[PDB]
Design a protein around this nucleic acid. Structure first.
Lengths: 173, 49, 132, 157, 226, 63, 228, 53
RNA sequence: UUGUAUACCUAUACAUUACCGCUAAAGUAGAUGAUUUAUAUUACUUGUGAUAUAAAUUUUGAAACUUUAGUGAGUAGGAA
RNA sequence: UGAUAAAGUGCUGAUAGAUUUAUAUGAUUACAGUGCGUUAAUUUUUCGGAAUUAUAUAAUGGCAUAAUUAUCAUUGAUUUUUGUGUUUAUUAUAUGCACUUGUAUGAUUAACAAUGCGAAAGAUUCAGGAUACCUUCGGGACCCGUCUUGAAACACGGACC
């Protein structure tokens, strides 16, 4: 889907020998909240003990990008499983939302490295400014004043007329 | 209550036309806008008990 | 016409065609009349597509209009004149059909007596001899 | 703006007036000062006062079984969903020719020398304005490619 | 004797519609108590969550009773321990839905029977629409639609205290002490097929979609099936 | 597809004697009326035992 | 008096009575006169009206009778209001653009050509054979005389000869085709009221005279984004 | 889904909506656009569009 | 090709309905003035009941009719 | 701003279907609606009009406590059985008699209208019909019996009656 972010919090439900277990939290990227509560458990089983059934899910809440029309570069610290292959990457994308950059990373890994998405762990996701990005296909856009003439449109198929009388003509003037 | 939300809308829209008050597009409007005089009795004449 | 049944129903036939024995077209020793195929490989019996259909009992006729002729009535064979008088009280529900071996001499009483009793016959004007 | 759901498609019922939401244009504006709106859903072809063009393209089937009760009909100008649903409900006919009657000039003066098989459009078929029809008899199949006519009645607007 | 038969069967007729008019009056004052329970319950949880934010805590809401469990796959190629859970849940056909209590003894049956099943946590609206539109009932082993309150009352009012439909909606939604009878009274809900259909049917919901716990998205799927 | 209807789906009781004795089937006519209209299990035992065979109705002594 | 009032007929499951309507009875006039009407009798002056028993000692028969009779009500029409220029889609005047006059109490539509323009009389069209166009002539004070209703031109009769009897009489039938002179009189009254209000506007291809040119559907057209 | 015109108003690359709104008015773009050579052509197809009987 | 998006098409599957069967359950058997139903006189409650006079339906191959539910793959084979 | 949820929310336009021999052996059952109905105020368009308020009893909420029961956390909050008034809201019962083309017709499908007369002997109108075919077209479609794990088999048998 489109992969919005959440904060899933978990406990280890306190048998009376232990009062008030220490409450870890996350930043999970997921299509929906039913799948964010098995990405919490997948990532925490690497880190602390307490699986489910022996833990609780305290509040999972969605976080709503704090500037949806400001324009910023997102660096994603990733690690994935290739065919021979656990690696780390640091990818950079350019977007407005932070769930929209993570989802622009889950396609790119599928395109470029064949990476079906169960292999990708996300470490960190930031909003790095500029003159901290490196990633030359993102530094293309870090200059006012940028021009680029367009060549891009739609060319309906068949059309509102399949057998046209007047030739689309990719160019004019 | 849905029939009462209608009357508050067609009244508050028509403050730029405010024609009638008779029967055509304001029977289902201005009759019940003046049947709040029929609940002026209920506060006034019912405090005799 | 004559005495049409008792506010007649509209007959719905599940299929009008009949059932043809498998491979009965290939041989002139096979009648078309349905035999169930028993053979171990038979693609009719194993109900493959495109083949000739088998008669199951989902094809059975409505129980209201089972054995009803197109004219509304069930059928009653008549063999002589006294057997026609059984239909004095059944003429809203039954036809009458004269048995093929009732002669022309005696079929004339039966078509006579079945206008009085108002029995609708299925084969009137058969084995006449429409002369004197 | 879904809090402004009452005021997107809003022009004519407040121009009638039926409870009057908001009678503002959204016109695909030829009036130019606030020119807006979506040159929305066109695909023109003709034929048609009665006798709007369809062709019986074939039965309503899967790739290996046929279901020859519904029938797909391609209509002349329609090639989106909005276009092929205008005809939904309406009455269709396959009219063709025979020679011989078993009838008289009881009515107009005929050898019954033109046949017809009527039907309804029941629904649409793809995303490109094809349609699904249900004739009284069944459409013989050598009718494929031939003209079916979309009568403009049972008439909605 | 027939001279006493109009004497007897005219008070047995007068008393009969005095009962039915009595129980018409209960079922309005009964179902008004139930409908006010649900409104207070919802405004409680809103009040509690908004308190625990201001008290700088968390409010973990209650883990759920009431699964609604649908059978989504197959009667062919099924294993005997998962064939047996689906006969104890009364799930013997595709798109069969039943109502299930969520104790630990049945979750470990919902985990055995997982790839053939989806489940989740119904709304009140989904409890009503399944019993209004789809709710049939079991009358001496036969399946009897609803069509009135006498089909529910004639079998669950001497023993249990269920006479209305909203009774049967009460002790299924708020899982009451006669839930065992309120849900075995029903037949399994012979649901339609979704509109728009399915997602994969042989991956988990959390993989890419279908079987197992959808958990709140059982509601959206019952709109398609009811 | 649904499950699964072997047996003894069709119950293998008797519902009639296998017996063309007319005096015996006149007692079945009484006792279907008597069982249905007086719902005593006495009259249902007499009816169900009136259907039975020569085995299952053994003799009984005068002693 | 009043205040009984079934006001369901739109909403209608919240049907607006029974929160109010039972709240006017202070035991008002609990009365009856109400004859156990003794007209039905074996009553003779001498007449002996008993009645008789004809064959109901009967025919041997479920003599033909069908089930019973649920009846016609609510008529709902599209928002086509007179005088719109309709287009007659069908039925013997197909293609002609007629003018609406009124609707029936059976949901039909009263249309004139007017007869001087279209040669289409005062006849009645079902609105399932009509495209109601966007061209409406204003008729701010037109009468539509109130003897123009369902039982007016309505069929009768073919006596087949003189109602003589069951004789087989030979050819040269001239059975029906009048129209009456009060039939012809009426579209001199409504057309002279129409051919003044049609002409009352700045003309176009219908709007003051030319309403005579029979809709057809040419090349590069539609039915399906033609705003008729 | 964009088709480019010949007009280029001037604001900073990181401007908020009020600076953009201020610059449409100073350019006199509404009065220029509706008399532009083929915004005229837009409204004739809009006039030709769907065209009452 | 990889990762996704909506919108469609497609089974003998699923839902509803009509019909066949099978299964399982249930009803019905005062005919003599038996049961009703519509009127027409009186005891009386206001109203109902009873007597009387005004038309029919019902001798359900009790192995028959009537009611309701579910259900349907089949070689070897068994059984009606 | 959006997303999720709920309210016969409401409206619109469609499609397909409609058991039903109401006794060839059990009420057309009850519900509900419409027609004459003591009043008196208060309004309303002003038309046969229309609305409201005024009657008892029984509840139920909202509110104000006083109890009580019992629990996340307890500065408090939630909760069970109550009580009484403060109160302000909402439902229910109190519609009898006669009549009528208003629901379940106790698997409802029922109406208006067009066409067409079942002629004394014999036409015609409408609908239907793989009767044994022929014509035309699209989909399906291997040859049966057999032994076999598996047959259309380049396994065996079978030219036809």
């Amino acid at each position: 889907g489109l992969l919005k972010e959440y904060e899933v919090v978990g406990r280890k439900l306190p048998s009376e020998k232990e009062p008030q277990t220490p409450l870890y939290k996350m930043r999970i990227f997921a299509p929906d909240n039913i799948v964010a509560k098995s990405r919490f458990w997948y990532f925490l089983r690497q880190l602390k003990k307490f699986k489910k059934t022996t833990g609780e899910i305290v509040s999972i809440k969605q976080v709503y990008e704090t500037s949806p029309v400001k324009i910023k570069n997102f660096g994603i610290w990733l690690r994935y499983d290739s065919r021979s292959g656990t690696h780390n990457m640091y990818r950079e994308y350019r977007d407005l939302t932070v769930g929209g950059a993570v989802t622009q990373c889950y396609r790119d890994m599928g395109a470029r490295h064949r990476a079906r998405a169960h292999s990708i762990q996300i470490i960190k996701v930031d909003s790095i400014p500029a003159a901290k990005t490196r990633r030359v296909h993102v530094k293309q856009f870090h200059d006012s004043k940028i021009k680029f003439p367009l060549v891009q449109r739609v060319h309906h198929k068949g059309n509102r007329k399949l057998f046209s009388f007047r030739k689309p003509r990719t160019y004019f003037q | 209550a849905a029939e009462k939300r209608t009357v508050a809308k067609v009244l508050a829209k028509a403050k730029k036309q405010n024609v009638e008050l008779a029967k055509s597009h304001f029977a289902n409007v201005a009759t019940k806008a003046a049947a709040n005089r029929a609940k002026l009795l209920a506060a006034r004449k019912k405090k005799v008990a | 016409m004559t005495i049409r049944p008792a506010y007649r129903p509209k007959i719905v036939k599940k299929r009008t065609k009949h059932f043809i024995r498998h491979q009965s077209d290939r041989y002139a020793k096979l009648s078309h009349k349905w035999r169930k195929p028993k053979g171990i490989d038979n693609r009719v019996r194993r109900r493959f597509k495109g083949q000739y259909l088998m008669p199951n009992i989902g094809y059975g006729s409505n129980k209201r209009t089972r054995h009803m002729l197109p004219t509304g009535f069930k059928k009653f064979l008549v063999h002589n004149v006294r057997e026609l008088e059984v239909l004095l009280m059944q003429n809203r529900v039954y036809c009458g059909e004269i048995a093929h071996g009732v002669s022309s001499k005696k079929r004339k009483e039966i078509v006579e007596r079945a206008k009085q009793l108002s029995v609708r016959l299925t084969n009137p004007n058969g084995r006449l001899r429409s002369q004197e | 703006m879904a809090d402004t759901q009452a005021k997107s498609t809003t022009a004519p019922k407040a121009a009638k007036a039926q409870k009057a939401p908001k009678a503002v244009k959204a016109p695909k504006a030829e009036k130019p000062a606030a020119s807006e709106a979506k040159v929305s859903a066109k695909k023109y072809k003709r034929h048609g006062r009665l006798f709007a063009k369809a062709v019986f393209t074939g039965y309503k089937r899967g790739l290996r079984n046929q279901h020859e009760n519904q029938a797909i009909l391609k209509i002349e100008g329609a090639r989106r969903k909005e276009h092929g649903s205008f005809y939904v409900g309406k009455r269709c006919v396959y009219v063709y020719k025979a020679e011989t009657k078993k009838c008289v000039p009881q009515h107009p003066e005929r050898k019954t020398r033109v046949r017809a098989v009527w039907g309804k459009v029941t629904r649409i078929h793809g995303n490109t304005g094809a349609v699904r029809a249900r004739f009284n008899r069944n459409l013989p199949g050598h009718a494929m490619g031939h003209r079916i006519r979309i009568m403009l009645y049972p008439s909605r607007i | 004797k027939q001279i006493s038969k109009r004497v007897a069967e005219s008070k047995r007729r007068l008393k009969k519609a005095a009962v039915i008019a009595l129980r018409k009056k209960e079922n309005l004052v009964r179902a008004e108590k139930y409908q006010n329970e649900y409104i207070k319950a919802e405004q409680r949880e809103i009040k509690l969550r908004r308190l625990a934010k201001k008290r700088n805590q968390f409010y973990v809401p209650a883990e759920a009773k009431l699964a609604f469990v649908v059978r989504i796959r197959g009667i062919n190629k099924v294993a005997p321990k998962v064939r047996k859970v689906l006969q104890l849940f009364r799930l013997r056909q595709i798109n069969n839905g039943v109502f299930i209590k969520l104790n630990k003894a049945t979750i470990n049956m919902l985990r055995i029977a997982e790839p053939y099943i989806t489940w989740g946590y119904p709304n009140l609206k989904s409890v009503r629409e399944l019993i209004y539109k789809r709710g049939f009932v079991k009358h001496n082993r036969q399946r009897v639609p609803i069509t009135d309150n006498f089909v529910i009352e004639r079998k669950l009012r001497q023993a249990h205290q269920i006479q209305c439909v909203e009774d049967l909606v009460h002790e299924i939604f708020t899982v009451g002490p006669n839930f065992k009878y309120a849900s075995n009274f029903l037949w399994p809900f012979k649901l339609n097929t979704p509109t728009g259909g399915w997602r994969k049917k042989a991956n988990h919901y959390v993989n890419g979609g279908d079987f197992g716990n959808r958990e709140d998205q059982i509601n959206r799927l019952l709109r398609k099936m009811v | 597809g649904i499950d699964i209807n072997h047996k003894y789906d069709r119950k293998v009781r008797r519902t009639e004697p296998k017996s063309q004795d007319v005096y015996l089937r006149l007692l079945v006519k009484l006792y279907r009326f008597l069982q249905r209209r007086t719902n005593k299990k006495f009259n249902r035992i007499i009816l169900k035992r009136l259907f039975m065979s020569k085995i299952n109705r053994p003799p009984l002594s005068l002693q | 008096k009043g205040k009984k009032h079934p006001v369901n007929s739109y909403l209608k499951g919240g049907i607006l009575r029974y929160s109010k309507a039972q709240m006017y009875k202070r035991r008002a006039l609990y009365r009856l006169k109400d004859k156990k009407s003794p007209v039905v009798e074996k009553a003779k002056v001498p007449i002996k009206k008993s009645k008789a028993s004809y064959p109901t000692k009967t025919f041997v028969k479920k003599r033909p009778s069908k089930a019973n009779f649920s009846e016609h009500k609510r008529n709902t029409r599209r928002n086509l209001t007179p005088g719109t220029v309709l287009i007659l889609l069908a039925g013997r005047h197909q293609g002609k653009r007629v003018v609406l006059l009124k609707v029936l109490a059976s949901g039909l539509l009263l249309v004139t050509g007017p007869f001087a323009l279209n040669s289409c009389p005062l006849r009645r069209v079902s609105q399932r054979y009509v495209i109601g166009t966007s061209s409406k002539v204003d008729l701010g004070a037109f009468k539509v005389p109130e003897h123009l209703n369902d039982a007016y031109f309505r069929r009768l009769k073919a006596k087949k000869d003189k109602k003589t009897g069951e004789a087989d009489i030979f050819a040269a039938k001239k059975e029906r085709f009048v129209p009456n002179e009060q039939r012809k009189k009426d579209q001199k009254e409504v057309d002279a009221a129409l051919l003044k209000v049609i002409k009352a506007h700045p003309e176009g291809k219908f709007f003051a005279k030319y309403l005579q040119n029979m809709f057809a559907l040419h090349s590069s057209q539609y039915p399906h984004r033609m705003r008729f | 889904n964009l088709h480019l015109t010949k007009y280029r108003i001037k604001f900073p690359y990181t401007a908020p909506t009020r600076i953009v709104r201020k610059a449409w008015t100073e350019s006199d773009l509404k009065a220029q656009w509706k008399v532009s050579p083929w915004s005229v052509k837009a409204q004739n197809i809009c006039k030709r569009s769907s065209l009452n009987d």
